Each structure stands twice: as structure tokens, then as C-alpha cells.
Amino acid sequence: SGFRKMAFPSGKVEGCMVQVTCGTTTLNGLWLDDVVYCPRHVICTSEDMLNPNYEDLLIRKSNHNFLVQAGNVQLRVIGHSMQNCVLKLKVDTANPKTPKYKFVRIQPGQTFSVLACYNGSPSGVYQCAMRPNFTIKGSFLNGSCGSVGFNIDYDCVSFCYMHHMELPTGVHAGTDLAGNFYGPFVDRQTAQAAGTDTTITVNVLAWLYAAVINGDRWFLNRFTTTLNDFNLVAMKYNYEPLTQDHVDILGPLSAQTGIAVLDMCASLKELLQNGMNGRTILGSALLEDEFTPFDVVRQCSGVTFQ
Amino acid sequence: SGFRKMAFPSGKVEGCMVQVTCGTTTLNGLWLDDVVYCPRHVICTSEDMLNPNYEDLLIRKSNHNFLVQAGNVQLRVIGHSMQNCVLKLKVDTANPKTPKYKFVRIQPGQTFSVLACYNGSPSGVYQCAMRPNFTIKGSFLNGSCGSVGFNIDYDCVSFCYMHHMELPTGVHAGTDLAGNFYGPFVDRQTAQAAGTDTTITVNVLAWLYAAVINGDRWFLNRFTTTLNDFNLVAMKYNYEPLTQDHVDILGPLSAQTGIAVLDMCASLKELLQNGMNGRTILGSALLEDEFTPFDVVRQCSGVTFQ
Ligand SMILES: *[C@H](O)[C@H](C[C@@H]1CCNC1=O)NC(=O)[C@H](CC(C)(C)C)NC(=O)[C@@H](NC(=O)OCc1ccccc1)C(C)C
Ligand SMILES: *[C@H](O)[C@H](C[C@@H]1CCNC1=O)NC(=O)[C@H](CC(C)(C)C)NC(=O)[C@@H](NC(=O)OCc1ccccc1)C(C)C
């Protein structure tokens, strides 16, 4: 028993991290087969960064301008090309540590692990959710760009995020591995704001099921509600709408605990209307929304990976 | 910017995890050089476990009773011996993935990363603190015994914890890697209880400094207090005493933020006496105590590891 914010084991990704230095910029790259993926704004300098034209900046570059460093071994760049907001640097050596992988784009509400890196060297690993407003609430310092977010599916690493920038509220924006931003952000030093966020309702209910599996039941109640009456309550509290699909994904957790999804909705309603009365749930005094139904099942059932 | 509960990258430890099966018990082992470390209660079966005599149970075992599995490669056991509550199984193959390592025993209040494993296969990684009552609040299911907790110091892995058991409040108990339990617990199925916990005051103050570095300042105040007047307030709220040493370790954070340690104590006092008034600090509605002063510096400064 117990419930923790749990990251995927990071070994498979640590072996793919390299340092990319060009001009006055150093950042992290992702080395899979003979390609190194990194944020395209490495080809910049601090005045290029007010409003650049990356297509122009890139034809001015030479292969030998890109210093790629895999630990204490240098990689020769033999080609370069830009795919949206990422650079693909072709190197003459294929990474012998390349895991089975996919590039996947995730949906708001879904979670992933982030391997925070500096200078090609992993610093820490932590779990994140993609917020409804396509930001993530990460922990990133200068030099962390090119760190990647990922999920693991048995032995396959699905890369879903590459880090690019911090927005003024301390939240973070980035791209998928094909270089397409999550949300309406651009890799420019121009005024940009996150936009209004909402709470991920299906994840909150999942975390309430995790609590019940773990012995926290005080918030349960005999009442029930309709899907429609629940969604009027979520609207007011800035929760995002609950669909019949979300009810289906919560079926397994409903079955394991004996609590109908719509009964747990009625509990969420009262929690929203009454607060928590100085009590806690799974050691939080807030309703937590960064655990998906799948995260809960993995942790409360013991799924592993090879 | 941003602050997250951040684990160490786990790759160095993933390469050391193996599966140990003996009789009707399967658990995880730690494979360093030609020795596999695992909990001694693997040599048990479910009626041995009410009150065993492990010295007796172990001389009855044969080397060939221990099935050690490093992925899809079996390791031959060539010797066995017991060191307190862990077994050391000598195998004829040294682990080519053995990192530089140390066995260290940690102090209550200190943190570490846990690589939760089942059947020798890593499942997830998360950060823990050793509670004042020598339990940890982990996430462990049946089959997770032998999972280890650790810190990384540049390239060196300091192993500090091996998992053994869950106590009735859902908290977890284990040993250091020399097999000596943290706290007054024994690896027996006899009635055992955690004992009264307290809040780790120095870590709470560290997390308040992390908040200030990250832009949360609402809890700051013009007031101050003495170390002595602060400790009378901590006593009442079940916080553990703050020493002049703790004030010294908080010096760096005090210097970076311009907030004297005793000024942050006065803020903690009011937070303890008034609550948080429905506000949050670093996205928590509770005072968080599982970040050490070092954890805060690492995350707010960007220390890496190779
Ligand atoms: C890559 O190492 C780095 C990662 C940042 C550094 C601090 N935290 C991080 O996650 N990314 C950058 O330095 C960005 C570079 C560009 C913009 C992608 C070229 N810069 C930023 O992240 C900056 N954000 C912005 O410039 O955009 C928002 C904004 C809002 C208002 C006015 C101007 C710009 C921040 C300021 C570091
Ligand atoms: C090892 O895989 C496993 C890990 C447990 C399983 C569930 N969560 C975990 O962390 N450890 C065990 O199964 C323990 C085996 C012994 C006791 C070390 C031989 N057993 C336990 O963890 C059990 N705890 C106790 O038996 O001790 C406390 C207690 C309190 C009151 C009455 C009897 C015993 C629990 C019940 C699984």
C-alpha cells in the first residue's frame, strides 16, 4: 500500500542524453540511432532570440559548428536539418544504447516522466501532467532545454515532450519530438502567457479511487448524482467536463472498490462545495489532479517494465 | 524555476536489480560485484513467518535452492551467508554494471530515492524521507521486498535502504544494506506499530526557502523570534526541535534569499498558529517536510551527476 508521485525508471533515457554546444549556447540533445534531436534555438545567440528567422540562421551554420558530446566522447556531425522547432543532427555513430522507442504526442490530462538534464547529464526525474492549457508545471533551470518527457510501455520508450521555455508564471512549454509545440507558444522571446487553466476532473476521481484502495474513505457518502448534475458543479469550480468516456475509463477502479463512478462524483461534489474541513486525502490537503486512471492502476497493481 | 519532488536518475541502480526465488518466495536482490544482497526472509514460507529462527532456517538451505535471475540470464549461487537481516548470495559472475557505490546509514529527516521493483524489474522511482520514527511513507506491494533506496553523489551510489515490510498504518520499514533495521522493527509477523511521528522542522524551513526562491512570499513577515521562543512553538505543534546546527545548514539558503533563518522561523510560527487561510505554498496546502536543505539547493541550483 501507499501512493506516491512515481516516475518511470529513467535508465533507458539516461543513455540517450548528450550535450549540444553551438556558438554561445549549450543545451541537451536526445541521441537515437545516428540522429541527435535538440531544440532549434541552439543556433541562436541572445539577440537572435528577440525575433529570429531560424531558416535563415540555419543555412548560415556549418556541420562543424555543432559540438556534440556523449559524455567524454565527441560525436562528429555529418548532416543537419530542421523539423519544425527541433534540430536533427546526423552523426556518424549510432547510439549503441538506443532503446525501442516511439514519438507520440500526448493529450492534456495525460502524465509523463521528465528527466531533467544539464550539459547532457541527468539531474533528476519527476512526474508531470500536461495541463489543459498545454503547459506543464515542471522544474527547469537555465541549460535544461532539450530535456525530454516520456512514458515506458514494457520495453518501449514513448517520447512525448522536449523542453523549450519557461513562461512568466513559472510554468513550462515545449514540443513533441516532431518539433510541434504543445499549445499556442512559439520559441521566441516575445510576450507570451499561459492562458487560463482548469482542473483535470477524471484524474481527481482516479486519485479518489486510489485513496479508497489505500484506506482513506472519510469523503465517501451515500448520495449520488447524474452525470449532468455533476457537470454543472464542475463548471462552477473550474473543473473540466466529465464525459461518459471518462466514466468508462474509471470502470476498472469502480469495479475494484465497489463504488459506482457517479457515487464518487457525488463525493467530489461535496468536497468541492464543503472543502476538506482540515482533513487530508493521501497526505494532500488539496484535490490532486496529476494521476491518471492508468497511473493509479499501475501503482495499486504493480506493473513493471523490461 | 519550479519545484518538484525529484528522484535521482535510476539507471545506475536498475542495472543492479535481480530476481531471487527460493522455495515459495520471490523477491528482489541487489547485485554488486559477485554478491547479491536480499532480505533474509526469502528463506521462509508463510508459517515460518509467524516466529522464525533464521540461523536454523539457513543451515538447512542449499546453494542450489537459490534461483537468481538477472533478466533472462540465470546466476549460479556458489556461497551464501547472513549479515543481520540481509542475505549475501555469492555468485560466480561479477556484475559488469556495478557502479561505484557505498553502503551508508541515513539519519531521520534525510531523503532518498526508491526504485520500486517486482520480480527483479524496476517499476517506478520516487523520493522518500526517513521519518523521525524510522518509518518511510512508501508505495510498496507484495513482491517489492528487496527494492533499495539510494542517493547519488556525482558518480557514486550510496545505498541506504532495503525494503522489508509494511506496518499496519500503511507505512514501511526496512534495513540499511548491512541488514540493520531502521527503528525498533523486526522481520517477523508479530504485532508491531510505528510509534508517534513528528514533523521535520529543518526541512519545512528549507521548503519555505524554496518557495521564496520560486516567488511565493505571502507568508513572509516583518516579525522575528528567538531560537528558544521558536522551539516552544514547535513543541506544541509536534514539530521536532530546531538546533543551532540546523540554523547553520540553512545559512546558504538564508544568504541567497536575504531572509534570516530566525525571520523564517517567525513566519513558520504564524503559519502554525494561523494556518494557511486557504492559500497554497509551492502548490501544497500543507507544510511540506520531505525536502532537505540540500534537496532545495540541488533543485534550485541545477546539480547533475555522471
Ligand atoms: C533552455 O535552457 C531555457 C530553459 C528555461 C530557462 C529558465 N527556465 C527554463 O525552462 N529556455 C530559454 O532560455 C528560453 C529561450 C527561447 C525563448 C526559447 C529562445 N527563454 C525562456 O524560457 C524565457 N521565456 C520567454 O522568453 O518567453 C515568455 C516571455 C514572456 C514575457 C516577455 C518575454 C518573454 C524565460 C524568461 C527564461
Ligand atoms: C515483501 O515483498 C513484503 C512487502 C510488503 C507486502 C505488502 N507491502 C509491503 O511492503 N513484505 C512482507 O510480506 C512482510 C514479511 C515479513 C513480516 C518481513 C516476514 N510482511 C509484512 O509486511 C506484513 N507486516 C507484518 O507482518 O508486521 C506488522 C504486523 C502488525 C500487526 C500484526 C501482525 C504484523 C504486512 C501485513 C504485509
XYZ file of C-alpha atoms and ligand atoms in Angstrom:
686
model
C 0.000 0.000 0.000
C 0.888 3.695 -0.159
C 0.586 6.193 -3.000
C 3.411 8.337 -4.363
C 4.049 10.543 -7.336
C 6.017 7.928 -9.206
C 8.234 8.396 -12.258
C 9.251 5.714 -14.732
C 12.737 4.281 -14.232
C 14.937 6.544 -16.277
C 17.872 4.321 -17.277
C 16.741 3.835 -20.881
C 16.572 7.612 -21.365
C 19.795 8.454 -19.478
C 21.763 6.530 -22.117
C 20.333 8.807 -24.838
C 21.266 12.179 -23.325
C 24.067 14.201 -24.896
C 25.364 17.767 -24.762
C 24.967 20.007 -27.810
C 27.007 23.202 -27.939
C 26.828 25.660 -30.800
C 28.250 29.148 -30.610
C 27.393 30.589 -27.210
C 24.586 28.119 -26.392
C 24.769 24.770 -24.625
C 21.762 22.500 -24.214
C 20.751 18.839 -24.114
C 20.100 16.562 -27.061
C 18.432 13.191 -27.491
C 20.589 10.601 -29.300
C 18.662 7.786 -31.011
C 20.343 5.674 -33.716
C 22.531 8.141 -35.685
C 20.366 11.245 -35.050
C 20.603 13.804 -32.237
C 17.394 15.747 -31.547
C 17.615 19.144 -29.857
C 15.765 22.479 -29.661
C 16.363 24.596 -32.737
C 17.090 27.736 -30.710
C 20.646 26.346 -30.033
C 21.656 28.013 -33.331
C 20.784 31.423 -31.781
C 22.579 33.991 -29.624
C 20.958 36.341 -27.113
C 19.999 38.983 -29.756
C 18.914 36.469 -32.391
C 16.410 35.470 -29.653
C 14.192 38.603 -29.722
C 12.643 37.649 -33.072
C 14.667 35.155 -35.148
C 14.190 33.567 -38.575
C 15.538 30.065 -37.963
C 15.507 29.033 -41.616
C 17.940 31.901 -42.300
C 20.038 31.173 -39.224
C 20.400 27.502 -40.146
C 21.755 27.782 -43.699
C 24.486 30.008 -42.183
C 25.584 27.132 -39.944
C 28.243 24.551 -40.717
C 28.255 20.926 -39.590
C 31.457 21.663 -37.647
C 29.687 24.445 -35.728
C 27.789 21.753 -33.736
C 29.789 20.240 -30.884
C 28.029 17.052 -29.792
C 29.401 15.441 -26.631
C 28.321 11.965 -25.460
C 29.919 12.027 -22.030
C 33.643 12.264 -22.704
C 33.347 11.117 -26.341
C 32.738 13.650 -29.091
C 30.293 12.876 -31.919
C 31.003 14.179 -35.425
C 28.051 15.961 -37.058
C 27.732 14.836 -40.701
C 24.420 16.499 -41.534
C 21.781 18.735 -40.036
C 18.176 19.547 -40.787
C 15.276 21.275 -39.104
C 11.882 19.707 -38.393
C 9.599 22.432 -37.047
C 11.082 23.613 -33.735
C 13.654 20.768 -33.303
C 17.018 20.209 -34.996
C 18.042 16.774 -36.229
C 21.842 16.465 -36.252
C 23.006 13.408 -38.167
C 26.122 11.910 -36.548
C 28.426 9.210 -37.896
C 27.880 6.942 -34.860
C 24.657 5.168 -33.963
C 23.877 5.111 -30.255
C 24.528 1.527 -29.032
C 22.164 2.266 -26.129
C 19.161 3.157 -28.346
C 16.049 1.583 -26.766
C 12.955 0.597 -28.661
C 11.128 3.901 -28.954
C 8.249 5.849 -30.465
C 7.496 9.530 -30.838
C 3.968 10.081 -29.523
C 2.021 13.266 -28.913
C 0.080 13.271 -25.633
C -3.338 14.832 -24.732
C -3.946 17.346 -21.927
C -4.630 15.402 -18.760
C -2.074 12.708 -19.535
C 1.091 12.331 -17.466
C 4.738 11.565 -18.181
C 8.124 11.435 -16.535
C 10.701 14.165 -17.097
C 14.433 13.503 -16.959
C 15.833 16.924 -16.118
C 19.328 17.314 -17.557
C 22.112 19.906 -17.711
C 25.143 19.664 -20.044
C 23.988 16.235 -21.267
C 23.957 14.872 -17.688
C 20.746 13.734 -15.921
C 19.957 15.636 -12.732
C 16.663 14.185 -11.545
C 13.473 12.529 -12.618
C 9.934 13.567 -11.781
C 6.343 13.079 -12.879
C 4.320 15.784 -14.730
C 0.904 16.243 -16.277
C 0.177 18.123 -19.487
C -2.188 20.811 -18.222
C -5.432 21.631 -20.045
C -3.749 24.854 -21.172
C -0.824 22.906 -22.762
C 1.722 23.977 -20.157
C 3.453 21.721 -17.668
C 4.380 22.618 -14.110
C 8.000 21.495 -14.203
C 11.305 22.230 -12.506
C 13.717 23.629 -15.074
C 16.723 25.939 -14.798
C 18.849 27.614 -17.437
C 20.506 24.915 -19.528
C 17.706 22.352 -19.121
C 16.338 22.803 -22.650
C 16.364 19.593 -24.615
C 15.404 17.524 -21.557
C 12.691 15.087 -22.594
C 9.474 13.714 -21.120
C 8.452 10.126 -21.661
C 6.381 7.079 -20.789
C 7.521 3.458 -20.873
C 5.330 0.647 -22.249
C 7.005 -2.622 -21.267
C 10.342 -2.140 -23.062
C 9.340 0.718 -25.400
C 10.005 4.371 -24.549
C 7.352 6.733 -25.921
C 8.949 10.184 -26.021
C 6.284 12.844 -25.745
C 7.972 16.095 -24.678
C 11.081 18.173 -25.304
C 11.621 21.215 -23.091
C 11.997 24.687 -24.680
C 10.996 27.572 -22.414
C 9.589 28.985 -19.180
C 6.547 31.284 -19.189
C 6.143 34.201 -16.752
C 4.001 32.283 -14.231
C 6.824 29.769 -13.685
C 5.257 27.123 -15.909
C 6.900 25.448 -18.848
C 6.283 24.970 -22.553
C 7.749 22.610 -25.090
C 7.202 20.481 -28.168
C 6.595 16.877 -29.063
C 9.593 15.122 -30.613
C 8.477 16.114 -34.127
C 9.072 19.706 -33.023
C 5.445 20.838 -32.810
C 4.645 22.929 -29.760
C 2.096 21.949 -27.199
C -0.278 24.903 -27.138
C -0.109 28.338 -28.732
C 3.511 29.061 -27.826
C 6.487 29.916 -30.039
C 10.233 29.658 -29.368
C 10.725 33.431 -29.367
C 11.431 35.974 -26.626
C 8.117 37.751 -27.153
C 5.352 38.368 -24.638
C 3.507 35.091 -24.077
C 1.123 33.969 -21.342
C -0.175 30.532 -20.380
C -3.858 31.164 -20.535
C -6.500 30.045 -18.053
C -6.057 26.525 -16.650
C -8.655 24.050 -15.358
C -8.614 21.028 -13.084
C -8.479 17.582 -14.730
C -11.689 16.053 -13.329
C -11.142 12.463 -14.454
C -7.727 12.402 -12.740
C -9.181 13.787 -9.474
C -11.711 10.953 -9.425
C -8.952 8.453 -10.173
C -6.960 9.775 -7.215
C -10.057 9.473 -5.014
C -10.240 5.799 -6.037
C -6.548 5.469 -5.176
C -7.391 6.871 -1.733
C -10.177 4.320 -1.220
C -7.869 1.482 -2.245
C -5.404 2.825 0.347
C -7.904 3.160 3.248
C -8.951 6.844 3.060
C -12.761 6.666 2.973
C -13.959 9.639 5.055
C -15.107 11.580 1.973
C -17.413 8.790 0.822
C -21.159 9.303 1.079
C -24.487 7.549 0.485
C -25.600 10.199 -2.042
C -25.414 10.018 -5.822
C -25.775 12.354 -8.802
C -26.365 12.354 -12.530
C -23.579 12.963 -14.992
C -25.424 16.154 -15.966
C -25.930 17.424 -12.407
C -22.257 16.706 -11.717
C -21.089 18.710 -14.736
C -22.962 21.841 -13.585
C -20.996 21.590 -10.334
C -17.671 21.109 -12.168
C -18.333 24.131 -14.390
C -18.616 26.429 -11.370
C -15.392 25.207 -9.748
C -13.359 25.394 -12.978
C -13.172 21.623 -13.346
C -13.159 20.329 -16.822
C -16.263 18.457 -18.083
C -16.639 14.781 -17.316
C -17.715 12.657 -20.247
C -19.322 9.248 -20.459
C -15.966 8.080 -21.854
C -14.197 9.212 -18.653
C -16.814 7.169 -16.768
C -15.813 4.133 -18.854
C -12.067 4.507 -18.187
C -12.944 4.650 -14.463
C -14.865 1.361 -14.716
C -11.983 -0.856 -13.541
C -11.386 1.318 -10.463
C -15.120 1.416 -9.820
C -15.187 -2.385 -10.037
C -12.241 -2.946 -7.705
C -13.623 -0.674 -4.958
C -17.372 -1.277 -5.296
C -18.017 2.475 -5.661
C -20.037 3.487 -8.711
C -18.374 6.275 -10.698
C -21.399 8.518 -10.202
C -21.234 7.873 -6.447
C -17.635 9.078 -6.407
C -18.794 12.130 -8.370
C -21.262 12.922 -5.585
C -18.347 12.730 -3.143
C -16.305 15.115 -5.314
C -19.264 17.485 -5.405
C -19.427 17.725 -1.590
C -15.629 18.042 -1.410
C -15.902 20.944 -3.864
C -18.836 22.590 -2.053
C -17.618 21.980 1.535
C -13.871 21.764 1.355
C -11.924 19.192 3.281
C -12.542 20.519 6.818
C -8.859 20.372 7.711
C -8.619 16.686 6.763
C -6.231 15.147 4.231
C -6.522 12.621 1.420
C -3.453 10.504 0.615
C -1.431 13.069 2.562
C -2.676 16.041 0.477
C -4.869 18.879 1.738
C -5.816 19.627 -1.919
C -7.654 17.618 -4.558
C -4.857 16.208 -6.706
C -5.285 16.011 -10.478
C -1.944 14.722 -11.875
C -2.694 10.981 -11.578
C -4.499 9.341 -14.498
C -6.695 6.249 -14.079
C -3.802 4.297 -15.599
C -1.255 5.740 -13.163
C -3.480 4.628 -10.301
C -3.832 1.101 -11.677
C -0.057 0.790 -12.297
C 0.789 1.847 -8.787
C -2.027 -0.006 -6.998
C -1.393 -3.219 -9.027
C 2.387 -3.342 -9.504
C 3.089 -3.177 -13.262
C 6.803 -3.346 -14.166
C 8.938 -2.852 -17.298
C 11.850 -4.597 -19.023
C 12.071 27.804 -11.796
C 9.526 25.372 -10.356
C 9.818 22.881 -7.508
C 9.055 19.167 -7.738
C 9.568 16.083 -5.655
C 12.565 14.915 -7.621
C 14.223 11.494 -7.563
C 17.772 10.697 -8.618
C 18.136 9.196 -12.093
C 17.824 5.495 -11.506
C 19.850 3.938 -14.339
C 22.840 3.008 -12.172
C 20.554 1.101 -9.791
C 18.363 -0.527 -12.475
C 21.421 -2.433 -13.721
C 21.875 -3.967 -10.246
C 18.365 -5.375 -9.767
C 17.837 -9.129 -9.952
C 15.141 -11.629 -9.006
C 15.769 -14.045 -6.135
C 13.458 -17.034 -5.797
C 13.783 -19.602 -3.049
C 11.091 -22.123 -2.258
C 7.740 -20.357 -2.406
C 9.117 -16.798 -2.119
C 10.192 -14.407 -4.858
C 11.734 -11.021 -4.137
C 14.307 -8.551 -5.445
C 18.045 -8.625 -4.882
C 20.845 -6.117 -5.328
C 23.766 -7.396 -7.441
C 27.107 -5.659 -6.824
C 30.368 -7.312 -7.937
C 29.860 -11.060 -7.266
C 27.414 -10.650 -4.339
C 23.607 -10.489 -4.393
C 22.020 -8.777 -1.378
C 18.425 -9.604 -0.460
C 16.103 -9.759 2.568
C 16.755 -12.830 4.677
C 13.060 -13.708 4.944
C 13.263 -15.181 1.362
C 14.355 -18.450 3.037
C 10.939 -18.593 4.800
C 7.465 -19.882 3.940
C 4.170 -18.486 5.227
C 4.276 -20.478 8.530
C 7.994 -19.970 9.131
C 6.954 -16.270 9.131
C 4.991 -16.218 12.430
C 8.163 -16.500 14.527
C 11.216 -17.875 12.679
C 14.798 -18.653 13.707
C 16.705 -17.631 10.580
C 20.022 -19.103 11.694
C 18.302 -22.514 11.827
C 16.457 -21.979 8.556
C 19.651 -21.018 6.730
C 21.866 -24.018 7.524
C 19.010 -26.149 6.105
C 19.343 -24.363 2.759
C 21.481 -25.438 -0.173
C 23.217 -23.145 -2.652
C 21.061 -24.678 -5.403
C 17.897 -23.700 -3.509
C 18.522 -20.039 -4.517
C 17.394 -19.190 -8.043
C 18.994 -15.880 -9.011
C 17.765 -14.379 -12.284
C 19.455 -11.367 -13.926
C 16.847 -10.660 -16.576
C 16.856 -13.741 -18.785
C 20.264 -14.965 -17.553
C 20.492 -17.208 -14.509
C 23.240 -16.665 -11.916
C 24.759 -19.666 -10.131
C 24.911 -19.315 -6.335
C 28.310 -20.537 -5.072
C 28.008 -19.446 -1.446
C 25.595 -17.832 0.959
C 25.854 -16.095 4.295
C 23.687 -13.961 6.528
C 24.556 -10.470 7.768
C 21.881 -9.417 10.254
C 18.583 -9.215 8.344
C 20.057 -9.453 4.785
C 21.376 -12.462 2.861
C 24.570 -12.242 0.833
C 24.493 -14.770 -2.021
C 27.897 -15.192 -3.634
C 27.542 -15.798 -7.386
C 30.200 -16.879 -9.873
C 29.677 -13.797 -12.084
C 30.545 -10.229 -11.161
C 28.017 -7.650 -12.313
C 29.604 -5.772 -15.265
C 27.219 -2.893 -14.499
C 28.415 -2.406 -10.885
C 28.649 1.360 -10.241
C 30.936 2.961 -7.722
C 28.980 2.540 -4.507
C 28.925 2.828 -0.728
C 26.675 1.435 1.966
C 25.644 4.358 4.173
C 23.141 4.564 7.001
C 20.968 7.693 6.900
C 19.515 9.843 9.763
C 15.815 10.612 10.287
C 14.984 13.711 8.291
C 17.210 12.760 5.370
C 15.748 11.841 1.985
C 16.493 9.259 -0.694
C 15.140 7.840 -3.910
C 13.418 4.458 -4.009
C 13.479 2.231 -7.077
C 10.374 0.109 -6.601
C 10.837 -3.297 -8.221
C 8.906 -6.538 -8.725
C 10.483 -9.808 -9.953
C 13.845 -8.061 -10.435
C 12.261 -5.467 -12.767
C 12.066 -1.734 -11.902
C 8.536 -0.345 -11.753
C 8.978 3.280 -10.736
C 11.159 5.704 -8.884
C 10.127 8.149 -6.188
C 11.541 10.296 -3.409
C 11.126 9.448 0.326
C 12.182 10.788 3.697
C 13.204 8.684 6.679
C 10.617 9.768 9.240
C 11.602 10.670 12.808
C 10.010 7.378 13.866
C 12.262 5.381 11.455
C 9.456 4.508 9.051
C 9.127 5.695 5.478
C 5.899 6.552 3.698
C 6.455 4.492 0.565
C 4.467 2.753 -2.150
C 5.114 -0.976 -1.945
C 3.056 -4.008 -2.954
C 3.583 -7.705 -2.365
C 6.821 -8.735 -4.056
C 8.554 -5.360 -3.639
C 10.854 -6.520 -0.831
C 14.492 -6.103 -1.697
C 13.849 -2.812 -3.516
C 16.511 -0.337 -2.439
C 16.689 3.353 -1.566
C 19.667 5.450 -2.535
C 21.349 8.793 -3.107
C 23.850 9.640 -5.837
C 26.973 11.741 -5.180
C 28.427 12.626 -8.580
C 29.091 9.095 -9.877
C 28.832 7.198 -6.565
C 25.617 5.488 -5.445
C 25.154 5.500 -1.666
C 22.680 2.717 -0.888
C 20.840 3.490 2.317
C 17.670 1.368 2.395
C 16.407 -2.115 1.595
C 12.663 -2.717 1.857
C 11.331 -5.460 4.186
C 7.785 -4.881 5.433
C 4.616 -2.807 5.734
C 3.262 -1.756 9.141
C -0.476 -1.517 9.904
C -0.748 2.240 9.249
C 0.393 1.734 5.639
C 3.952 2.862 6.325
C 7.075 0.905 5.580
C 10.090 -0.444 7.433
C 13.422 -1.739 6.263
C 17.141 -2.028 6.890
C 20.348 -0.404 5.776
C 22.431 -2.522 3.399
C 24.322 -4.104 6.315
C 20.976 -5.600 7.336
C 20.328 -3.475 10.426
C 16.766 -2.241 10.747
C 15.843 1.385 10.869
C 13.925 1.700 14.124
C 12.639 -0.884 16.581
C 11.195 -3.264 13.994
C 11.924 -6.943 13.344
C 11.322 -9.081 10.243
C 8.642 -11.186 11.933
C 4.860 -11.384 11.570
C 4.260 -10.180 15.121
C 2.269 -7.173 16.280
C 4.314 -4.049 15.565
C 3.353 -0.378 15.415
C 5.181 2.655 14.043
C 5.151 4.853 17.068
C 4.388 8.567 17.216
C 5.819 10.658 14.365
C 6.845 14.330 14.288
C 7.344 16.942 11.597
C 10.912 17.566 10.381
C 11.249 21.284 11.200
C 14.516 21.968 9.378
C 13.064 20.533 6.148
C 9.896 22.670 6.453
C 12.050 25.790 6.694
C 14.105 24.622 3.722
C 10.919 24.211 1.688
C 9.820 27.709 2.728
C 13.133 28.999 1.333
C 12.451 27.035 -1.855
C 9.095 28.832 -2.053
C 10.744 32.250 -1.687
C 13.270 31.405 -4.396
C 10.289 30.455 -6.591
C 8.200 33.616 -5.945
C 5.840 32.528 -3.125
C 6.337 35.230 -0.479
C 2.877 35.807 1.039
C 3.799 34.038 4.296
C 6.757 36.332 4.943
C 6.521 38.852 7.763
C 8.442 41.679 9.444
C 8.471 39.854 12.808
C 11.266 37.765 14.286
C 11.775 35.315 17.151
C 14.469 33.712 19.254
C 15.562 30.147 18.718
C 14.171 29.422 22.192
C 10.798 31.109 21.631
C 10.511 29.246 18.324
C 11.156 25.861 19.943
C 8.301 26.332 22.445
C 6.009 26.832 19.446
C 7.376 23.738 17.654
C 6.892 21.588 20.762
C 3.164 22.347 20.841
C 2.604 21.538 17.160
C 4.601 18.282 17.278
C 7.486 19.712 15.271
C 10.857 18.427 16.132
C 13.314 20.791 17.893
C 15.373 23.186 15.826
C 19.027 23.345 16.764
C 21.695 25.946 16.157
C 23.228 23.388 13.773
C 20.020 23.353 11.685
C 20.326 27.157 11.586
C 23.849 26.745 10.176
C 22.808 24.310 7.418
C 20.137 26.871 6.436
C 22.775 29.613 6.135
C 23.257 29.268 2.360
C 19.503 29.499 1.722
C 19.283 32.414 4.135
C 22.101 34.118 2.225
C 20.599 33.579 -1.222
C 17.172 34.972 -0.253
C 18.140 37.693 2.234
C 15.827 36.197 4.885
C 17.448 35.488 8.243
C 16.770 31.949 9.468
C 15.096 33.286 12.604
C 12.869 35.503 10.442
C 11.703 32.443 8.521
C 11.056 30.768 11.881
C 8.726 33.632 12.802
C 6.890 33.002 9.527
C 6.595 29.286 10.348
C 5.243 30.200 13.771
C 2.381 32.266 12.293
C 1.721 29.557 9.688
C 1.454 27.067 12.559
C -0.744 29.331 14.713
C -2.962 30.704 11.899
C -2.989 28.085 9.205
C -2.715 28.964 5.562
C -6.104 30.690 5.120
C -6.935 28.664 2.025
C -3.702 29.704 0.289
C -1.023 27.382 -1.094
C 2.763 27.245 -0.984
C 4.565 25.650 -3.943
C 1.224 24.090 -4.871
C 0.725 22.447 -1.439
C -1.977 23.340 1.083
C 0.172 21.675 3.811
C 3.602 22.473 5.221
C 5.884 20.011 3.444
C 8.734 18.363 5.345
C 10.354 15.871 2.908
C 12.822 18.303 1.282
C 16.190 18.753 2.995
C 18.236 21.959 2.692
C 20.444 20.024 0.271
C 17.498 18.885 -1.856
C 16.426 22.509 -2.172
C 19.900 23.658 -3.207
C 20.249 20.826 -5.775
C 16.950 21.638 -7.389
C 17.207 25.441 -7.200
C 20.843 25.400 -8.471
C 20.960 22.554 -11.005
C 23.454 19.954 -9.716
C 23.911 16.945 -12.035
C 25.614 13.527 -11.869
C 27.821 11.370 -14.100
C 16.614 26.495 -22.279
O 17.749 26.094 -21.494
C 15.851 27.554 -21.489
C 15.051 26.888 -20.366
C 14.450 27.962 -19.473
C 15.499 28.757 -18.696
C 14.823 29.068 -17.359
N 13.774 28.063 -17.254
C 13.606 27.376 -18.380
O 12.884 26.413 -18.553
N 14.974 28.305 -22.380
C 15.147 29.612 -22.607
O 16.084 30.245 -22.129
C 14.144 30.317 -23.497
C 14.784 30.640 -24.860
C 13.809 30.842 -26.035
C 12.768 31.927 -25.760
C 13.073 29.549 -26.369
C 14.626 31.284 -27.255
N 13.691 31.544 -22.856
C 12.763 31.472 -21.901
O 12.371 30.422 -21.449
C 12.181 32.751 -21.402
N 10.782 32.818 -21.801
C 10.435 33.690 -22.756
O 11.243 34.468 -23.257
O 9.051 33.726 -23.223
C 7.994 34.289 -22.434
C 8.059 35.801 -22.307
C 7.086 36.451 -21.551
C 7.118 37.838 -21.406
C 8.120 38.587 -22.017
C 9.096 37.946 -22.777
C 9.062 36.561 -22.919
C 12.389 32.915 -19.892
C 12.265 34.387 -19.492
C 13.747 32.375 -19.443
C 7.985 -8.237 0.802
O 7.615 -8.419 -0.574
C 6.745 -7.769 1.560
C 6.480 -6.292 1.260
C 5.144 -5.890 1.864
C 3.950 -6.575 1.199
C 2.839 -5.524 1.243
N 3.553 -4.264 1.396
C 4.847 -4.435 1.653
O 5.702 -3.573 1.723
N 6.924 -7.989 2.990
C 6.156 -8.843 3.677
O 5.298 -9.535 3.138
C 6.376 -8.951 5.172
C 7.065 -10.287 5.508
C 7.837 -10.334 6.840
C 6.968 -9.963 8.041
C 9.040 -9.396 6.814
C 8.327 -11.771 7.051
N 5.100 -8.860 5.868
C 4.548 -7.660 6.056
O 4.994 -6.651 5.563
C 3.346 -7.581 6.936
N 3.696 -6.848 8.145
C 3.793 -7.528 9.294
O 3.538 -8.729 9.368
O 4.211 -6.830 10.506
C 3.343 -5.927 11.204
C 2.191 -6.608 11.918
C 1.279 -5.822 12.620
C 0.203 -6.414 13.281
C 0.030 -7.795 13.251
C 0.938 -8.590 12.555
C 2.010 -7.996 11.894
C 2.143 -6.986 6.194
C 0.839 -7.369 6.898
C 2.092 -7.441 4.736
